[PDB]
Design a protein around this ligand. Structure first.
Ligand SMILES: *[C@@H]1O[C@H](CO)[C@@H](O)[C@H](O)[C@H]1NC(C)=O
Ligand SMILES: [Ca+2]
Ligand SMILES: [Gd]
Ligand SMILES: [Gd]
Ligand SMILES: [Gd]
Ligand SMILES: [Gd]
Ligand SMILES: [Gd]
Ligand SMILES: [Gd]
Length: 475
């Protein structure tokens, strides 16, 4: 689907091997330390779409679907999908081609989109870079398709970052020479066929900073759908320029200050506030970026603090910020795993409860976002504007005048005192009645235009004009 089509989406990102098994078991063993295939499948995802859609998500992003290296290495199996070897075969662990097609059909059946994770940078190999038998890669069955074997020693050296290999001598990641026309033509033809065969609506591209810039325009075009790239860097000056060769990129610039602002009661609200303005100003289009605070490459939010008020605040931010919201499976169940492999916990071990605190929060946030968008076609391109900020609060406004959503976030935590915040700059007309769609209560805009926001337990507050909510089943 197009970039314009994707702006209104909300993504639930999941690891296919760790989300849902075909049998639907909630007890099937999965110790992250073992790093093996735990049994998640595409059919399993289909059976749990009610669970996902029940949170208000409009799309899912699943890990890579290509055939991987077969071995159980010293670092485990290729359960995550980032160690591919045969791109014209699917990973039998997740199911068959028919199953992947059934998944895309099941999503479309619900008016949802399927986003697939793809890797163009490298293959995977069990063993030292010197022992690589290039004949096992399809269609790149020759070392002529790859860059000479070297590891990335200095990540500040862009040439090294692009020309040398990821991984190490235990599990090496043969780096494709993406400067060669043969490699480009192959990848471009492949991606177009992949999207066509499985009716894929969008792509998430892995390790974009590791491939030279001139590769991506042709890739994005051949894909024929919206593409969001993973550029793993917190500097907006480094990451945002990739949006000039790709539709969107993951918002790593916001990630760091967002995490720091809420991971404790003493986080910097200033850094988050300024980064919102910086991305708003320096990135080609902030509304085509993907907002997140949790994924499989960083410790989960709850690993820093189990304060569920802090967790609710950051979840609210991800859903209401500029761009496409992205929640990582397990976040809604307050998962707290640390770095790889601790952050690849099986979602099924939680039992899938739909009444968990974070499930309800996400459902309420997505609900008003989805509704607002059906109310206001200008919402998605209306730049999120930070309207207020202090030591423990940040407030923002997004949406056309008269239909805007005003969000107030706090890092005071669950023990936060109860008080009233006189919020100014919300843009609402004096006397207008509003609804706090999270706790479902009403508040009237003061005669001065300021909103007397009832603050308690460090809970986030999301406001929207009450009259606009008629018809909705919200609150
Ligand atoms: C697409 O489908 C055709 C057969 O219908 C198959 O031969 C080809 O390998 C597929 N391409 C990809 C990238 O999966
Ligand atoms: Ca590379
Ligand atoms: Gd089923
Ligand atoms: Gd259903
Ligand atoms: Gd860097
Ligand atoms: Gd990556
Ligand atoms: Gd950097
Ligand atoms: Gd600027």
């Amino acid at each position: 689907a197009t970039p314009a089509d994707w702006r209104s989406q909300s993504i639930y990102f999941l690891l296919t091997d760790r989300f849902a098994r075909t049998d639907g078991s909630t007890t099937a063993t999965c110790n992250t330390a073992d790093q093996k295939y735990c049994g998640g499948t595409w059919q399993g995802i289909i059976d749990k779409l009610d669970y996902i859609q029940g949170m208000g998500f409009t799309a899912i992003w699943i890990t890579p679907v290509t055939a991987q290296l077969p071995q159980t290495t010293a670092y485990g199996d290729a359960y995550h999908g980032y160690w591919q070897q045969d791109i014209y075969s699917l990973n039998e662990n997740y199911g068959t081609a028919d199953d992947l097609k059934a998944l895309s059909s099941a999503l479309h059946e619900r008016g949802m989109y399927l986003m697939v994770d793809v890797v163009a940078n490298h293959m995977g190999y069990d063993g030292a870079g010197s022992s690589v038998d290039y004949s096992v890669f399809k269609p790149f069955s020759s070392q002529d398709y790859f860059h000479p074997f070297c590891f990335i020693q200095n990540y500040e050296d862009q040439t090294q970052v692009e020309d040398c290999w990821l991984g190490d001598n235990t599990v090496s990641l043969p780096d494709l020479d993406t400067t060669k026309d043969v490699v480009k033509n192959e990848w471009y033809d492949w991606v177009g066929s992949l999207v066509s065969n499985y009716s894929i609506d969008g792509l998430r591209i892995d390790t974009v900073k590791h491939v030279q810039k001139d590769f991506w325009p042709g890739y994005n075009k051949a894909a024929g759908v919206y593409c969001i790239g993973e550029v793993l860097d917190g500097d907006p000056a480094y990451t945002c320029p990739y949006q000039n060769v790709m539709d969107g990129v993951l918002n790593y610039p916001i990630y760091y200050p967002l995490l720091n602002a809420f991971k404790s009661t003493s986080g910097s609200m200033d850094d988050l506030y300024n980064m919102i303005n910086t991305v708003k100003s320096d990135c080609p289009d902030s509304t085509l970026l993907g907002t997140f605070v949790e994924n499989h490459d960083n410790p989960r939010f709850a690993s820093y603090t189990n304060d569920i008020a802090l967790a609710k605040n950051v979840a609210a931010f991800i859903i209401l910020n500029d761009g496409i919201p992205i929640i990582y499976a397990g976040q809604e169940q307050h998962y707290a795993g640390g770095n790889d492999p601790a952050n690849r916990e099986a979602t099924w071990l939680s039992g899938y409860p739909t009444d968990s605190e974070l499930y309800k929060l996400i459902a309420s946030a997505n609900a008003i976002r989805n509704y607002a968008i059906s109310k206001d076609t200008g919402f998605v391109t209306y730049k999120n504007w930070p309207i207020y900020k202090d030591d423990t609060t940040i407030a923002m406004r997004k949406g056309t005048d008269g239909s805007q959503i005003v969000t107030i976030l706090s890092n005071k935590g669950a023990s936060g005192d109860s008080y009233t915040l006189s919020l100014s700059g919300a843009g609402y007309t004096a006397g207008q009645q509003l609804t706090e769609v999270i706790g479902c209560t009403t508040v009237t805009v003061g005669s001065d235009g300021n909103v007397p926001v009832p603050m308690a337990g460090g809970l986030p507050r999301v406001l929207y004009p009450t009259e606009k909510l008629a018809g909705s089943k919200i609150c």
